[PDB]
Each structure stands twice: as structure tokens, then as C-alpha cells.
């Protein structure tokens, strides 16, 4: 379940929303809802 | 299926690559003209020339699918990741306008240039891919024919 450090959509660093089904951690801005903590 | 013909002016795309990434800049994305205002131009450009019912039906289907397709792709896989925080900036200004009417045709041609690598992920038949790539390359040619008022002329060196 070890989420890899770098981004799952571009390769950057920072805090990303974890995923359990896959260790994919996309940037909070690199989703396709473009969202800040709103939702 | 594998190939397009990007005419040797869109020297622009790779420049688009540099500024956003190295020579740090940005595109503020309330835009006029928008994508939807140019498809509906080229359509009206070419559809006056198609002869049979087959041609006009397939052209209409492709164009409607293209506005909707740019809509559904523009968010998740069409931005350089520096126009990403700014995408969040713009997503709060207009909440009641579809993404197919805020960007000029400079992201659309990114779609045009990366389309074949996406049709090499689906099991289309030869005539689907043939007519599709024919239409989008004709669109690229029409765009280089009129790039006066369509492409931007400056970049917005913006804060993070
Ligand atoms: Zn995943
Ligand atoms: Zn990211």
C-alpha cells in the first residue's frame, strides 16, 4: 500500500490524495475535478 | 492510424513547450475566439463544399463529437501542469460555462497533434481512422491559413 512519493500524473512533489486500490497519488490540482480542499 | 502532417509552422508547439516550462510564463484562459467559435467556422468553411449526404452526415458527426471530445479531455490530459493551478483559478470564475468555450484554438491543436497516438489505443477500423485523421489535418491546414486572429501573440508572465 506504499504510495510512491512523486506525483502520479506529472511527477512533482507535495501532498496528494492517497488511493488504496492502487498506489496512485495524483496532485490535488492534477485530477479532473480541478479542486482545492473544497470537495 | 500512425501519421499526420503537421505543417512546418506549428515551430509554435515546441515554443509553447518552452515558455510554460522553462522561460516560465502562462496563458490566462478567458479567451476570445474560443474553440467552439472556430470549429463552427471551419465547418461553415468546408460544409458548403460537400456534395452527397454521406459526406455531410459524417462531417457533422465528427464535429459534434469533437466539441464534446475536447470538452471531456481538456481537463485531465491536455495541460502542461503549469497551467494547472491557473486552471483551478479559472474554474472558480466561470462555473456555468463548458470548457469548449473558454480556450482559443491553441489547446485544440495540441489535441490535433496528439490524436494518432490515441487512436493507437482503440480498435477502430481503417475507414474510421482514415477519415478522422484526414479531417483533423485539414483543420490544421485551415488554421495555419488564418493564424492572425486565432493564436495568441504574447505570454502572461504570472505569479504561481
Ligand atoms: Zn490507481
Ligand atoms: Zn500532479
- Technique behind the model: cryo-EM
- Does A35 sit within 8 Å of B88, measured CB to CB? yes
How many beta carbons lie within 10 A of that of residue A20, not counting itself? 8
Q: CB under 8 Å to A23, separation ≥6 — which residues? A: A1, A2, A3, A4
User: Is B95 touching A (CB cutoff 8 A)?
Assistant: no
Cβ atoms of A8 and A24 within 8 Å: the answer is: yes
* Locus of grid cell 496512485: A24
Rounded CA gap, B127 and A7, in Å?
38
Cβ atoms of A36 and A28 within 8 Å: the answer is: yes
- From B89's Cα to the closest Cα of chain A, the distance in A is 9
Q: What is the resolution of this structure in A?
A: 2.9
* Locus of grid cell 452526415: B57
Domain hosting residue B4, numbered range: 1-160
3 state DSSP class of B51 = coil
- From B75's Cα to the closest Cα of chain A, the distance in A is 5
User: Is A14 touching B (CB cutoff 8 A)?
Assistant: no
Rounded CA gap, B26 and B160, in Å?
10
- From A36's Cα to the closest Cα of chain B, the distance in A is 8
H helices of B10-145, in order, are: 12-21, 36-46, 53-74, 85-93, 108-114, 116-119, 126-145
A9 neighbourhood in chain B, CB within 8 Å: 81
- Does A31 sit within 8 Å of B76, measured CB to CB? yes
Sign of the four-CA dihedral B73, B77, B78, B81: positive
Rounded CA gap, B16 and B63, in Å?
25
- The total of structural domains in chain B comes to 1
Rounded CA gap, B83 and B126, in Å?
36
Rounded CA gap, B34 and B106, in Å?
9
Amino acid at each position: 500500500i506504499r504510495n510512491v512519493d512523486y506525483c502520479s500524473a506529472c511527477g512533482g512533489r507535495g501532498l496528494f490524495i492517497c488511493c488504496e486500490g492502487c498506489p496512485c497519488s495524483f496532485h490535488l490540482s492534477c485530477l479532473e475535478p480541478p479542486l482545492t480542499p473544497e470537495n | 492510424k500512425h501519421k499526420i502532417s503537421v505543417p512546418d509552422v506549428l515551430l509554435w508547439l515546441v515554443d509553447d513547450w518552452e515558455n510554460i516550462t522553462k522561460n516560465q510564463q502562462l496563458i490566462a484562459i478567458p479567451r476570445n475566439p474560443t474553440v467552439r467559435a472556430a470549429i463552427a467556422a471551419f465547418r461553415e468553411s468546408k460544409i458548403s463544399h460537400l456534395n452527397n449526404e454521406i459526406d455531410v452526415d459524417v462531417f457533422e458527426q465528427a464535429m459534434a463529437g469533437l466539441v464534446i471530445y475536447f470538452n471531456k479531455c481538456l481537463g485531465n490530459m491536455l495541460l502542461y501542469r503549469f497551467e494547472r493551478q491557473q486552471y483551478l483559478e479559472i474554474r472558480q470564475q466561470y462555473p456555468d460555462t463548458e470548457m469548449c468555450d473558454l480556450y482559443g484554438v491553441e489547446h485544440l491543436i495540441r489535441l490535433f497533434v496528439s490524436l494518432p497516438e490515441l487512436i493507437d489505443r482503440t480498435n477502430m477500423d481503417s475507414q474510421s481512422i482514415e477519415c478522422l485523421l484526414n479531417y483533423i489535418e485539414e483543420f490544421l491546414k485551415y488554421l495555419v491559413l488564418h493564424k492572425d486572429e486565432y493564436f495568441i501573440k504574447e505570454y502572461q508572465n504570472a505569479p504561481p
